[PDB]
Structure 1
């Protein structure tokens, strides 16, 4: 039977093999939205060529590539399976992967969905907390696609642009935190400090009004309320790059600061991404937890397991789509408000693309 409802899972993605690193970076330094460089059409290929060696080396340290596609596919298969039983009126359901910087690209996914003659398409961001640099970029790509291809969508669109406090996402995080707490020696369990870590943002982005920090913060509170405030905590930020000011505290400085102040039992919790990637496997596990940890002498530092293939996460994904469908919403109320200091004209067009959908 023909696919009726399409679910486009959006993520920035990552290179599957070391050889995909160059093109991954090239597309990154070419995204007019997220970056502005003089004659960016010539600087990009150059910069990409320069950073490739260093980035390839990071992925080599974690096994040779990104596992995002593998986990995305599995979560997607589990979601569809549940949806066909949750919403028969919109079945059969089919998931598509739309990576912003690697294959399958957002554009390629859209072409395929259109080919499958779907009745409705749902842009489902895999980023629970909204950032104009992540979900916004992916949504802009959908608008730009149809605008460039000079055509109108043959299917009905709508978007699940954020879900920072979905009860099942919160339950998943809490469950992974609790089981990681069981791996610390029992005599130090209540002494453990929880560090929620999320990818940072340059202060120029935070200062224009990006929704991200406030939403990541909201996720942290829900998770801690569910854990009944069993351990003390702080929300810190990682992955800062360059000489410009980024939102802090920085995760690495915090780990080291805590140790120097007698808190040597730390639990790291990636609270802003749903699966393993360079941020957790390399940055946290290798850069920090190993080298940095082997410094100021930590007693125990562990990292909560990423959601990955957790069956309960697949249920969360399905419940979100199901609720989205019965709600008949086109996008969140939050998407109807661009950054108070937004200076990108595509943002407004993208918003209208969704709020203006037929039906």
Structure 2
């Protein structure tokens, strides 16, 4: 009886070649992308090819790959290597990764787990901050992928659906921020403004009651507490695209408006745990590199393989499994408020034993 530890997120293409199919999946989405009716399938192809050149340039501009997959797997591995030493009752812990839109997709990793012999599996959403658009979709696909590949409930699932202030996280973001603050002249240090940048969200998700904005803010404040508020800081938002209004102080505009007003400025990837397109591209090449004030624009190191961070992830799964609950008590609220053309309508059915 081995235990599946499944790191989940929306993923990125490990290689430039995987960009079309990645995009197709995203635009084929039920929930998020505006549904014609049945016709995502069709029209999603008609936009993936349209947008595949531009996003391909980008991934090539950072080394021809999204680092999400390697970093997901690597994390999932050291987690289980501590897990198998820390929770014997649960061992063996077999690491897995399953992305909502990149490879390996949810179906592709479910069948691997089924041939592999896992009996209970932990859907460990790699987002410390639940949003229905992220950790909701990843769950709602898992349900579809449970009714298909497993209509007689061989694998018993739970889900770590958020962890905004796990202390390995909070602590790893400090130290990192402090050590990235030491790259600054030193008479400036304490006046560098820590700009915490989270991927944004349409206002129409925000206005449903989504948990994501406040849960990000909880992580920021906890960091600044351990930093004893040495520095100024603001939580701002990046990655706005499309025509509808999105959330709150666009990261790029704030840095411009501040550039000629500040001795310096640090960017913090507050809402993801490894480098990906948002860090290596949008900030490094896009917000920092295309800027006059680039010499005072520095970015804090992403979490990735941070020893302190991975151990904090370890104790999180450790304490999730040993306290034997299937999901946080926010999750029924999350799904009652979220909007989706095909939703989990009972998380009791989805997680736990049902053979």
What TM-score does the superposition give when structure 2 sets the normalisation length? 0.95
Q: Deviations over 1:236-284 (max 9, x none)?
A: 0000001210002000000011124x11400100100000000000000
By how many angstroms is 1:211 displaced? 0.6
1:31 match: 29
Q: Does 1:110 align with 2:106?
A: no
By how many angstroms is 1:152 displaced? 2.5
CA contact (8 A) 1:124 1:160 kept: yes
Q: Does 1:224 align with 2:254?
A: no
CA contact (8 A) 2:155 2:353 kept: no
1:282 match: 281
CA contact (8 A) 1:78 1:311 kept: no
2:338 match: 342
Which residues in structure 2 correspond to 1:1-359 (within 5 Å)? 4-38=2-36, 39-149=39-149, 151-260=151-260, 262-291=261-290, 293-294=291-292, 297=293, 299-338=295-334, 341-344=337-340, 346-349=342-345, 351-354=347-350, 357=353
CA contact (8 A) 2:153 2:353 kept: no
By how many angstroms is 1:290 displaced? 1.1
Instruction: Give, in whole Å, the separation in 2 of the partners of 1:248 and 1:256.
Output: 15
Instruction: Give, in whole Å, the separation in 2 of the partners of 1:14 and 1:299.
Output: 29
Q: Deviations over 1:1-40 (max 9, x none)?
A: xx61111110111111211111110000001012123232
Instruction: Give, in whole Å, the separation in 1 of the partners of 2:61 and 2:55.
Output: 10
> Residues 161 and 46 (structure 1 numbering): CA distance in 2 closer, same or farther, change over 3 Å?
same
CA contact (8 A) 1:330 1:357 kept: no
CA contact (8 A) 2:197 2:269 kept: yes
By how many angstroms is 1:210 displaced? 1.0
Instruction: Give, in whole Å, the separation in 1 of the partners of 2:352 and 2:5.
Output: 19
CA contact (8 A) 1:208 1:340 kept: no
Matched length: 353
Q: Deviations over 1:56-98 (max 9, x none)?
A: 0111111111011111121111111101110111111111110
1:16 is paired with a residue of what secondary structure? coil
Instruction: Give, in whole Å, the separation in 2 of the partners of 1:358 and 1:147.
Output: 12
Instruction: Give, in whole Å, the separation in 2 of the partners of 1:115 and 1:178.
Output: 46
> Residues 224 and 301 (structure 1 numbering): CA distance in 2 closer, same or farther, change over 3 Å?
same
1:280 is paired with a residue of what secondary structure? helix
Instruction: Give, in whole Å, the separation in 2 of the partners of 1:78 and 1:138.
Output: 23
Instruction: Give, in whole Å, the separation in 2 of the partners of 1:188 and 1:73.
Output: 39
> Residues 10 and 35 (structure 1 numbering): CA distance in 2 closer, same or farther, change over 3 Å?
same
Please give the root-mean-square deviation of Cα atoms over the aligned residues, in Å.
Answer: 1.7
By how many angstroms is 1:150 displaced? 6.4
Instruction: Give, in whole Å, the separation in 2 of the partners of 1:166 and 1:143.
Output: 27
CA contact (8 A) 1:330 1:354 kept: no
* More displaced 10-residue stretch of structure 1: 29-38 or 189-198: 29-38
* More displaced 10-residue stretch of structure 1: 40-49 or 141-150: 141-150
Instruction: Give, in whole Å, the separation in 2 of the partners of 1:47 and 1:130.
Output: 28
By how many angstroms is 1:358 displaced? 5.1
What TM-score does the superposition give when structure 1 sets the normalisation length? 0.94
Instruction: Give, in whole Å, the separation in 2 of the partners of 1:41 and 1:355.
Output: 29
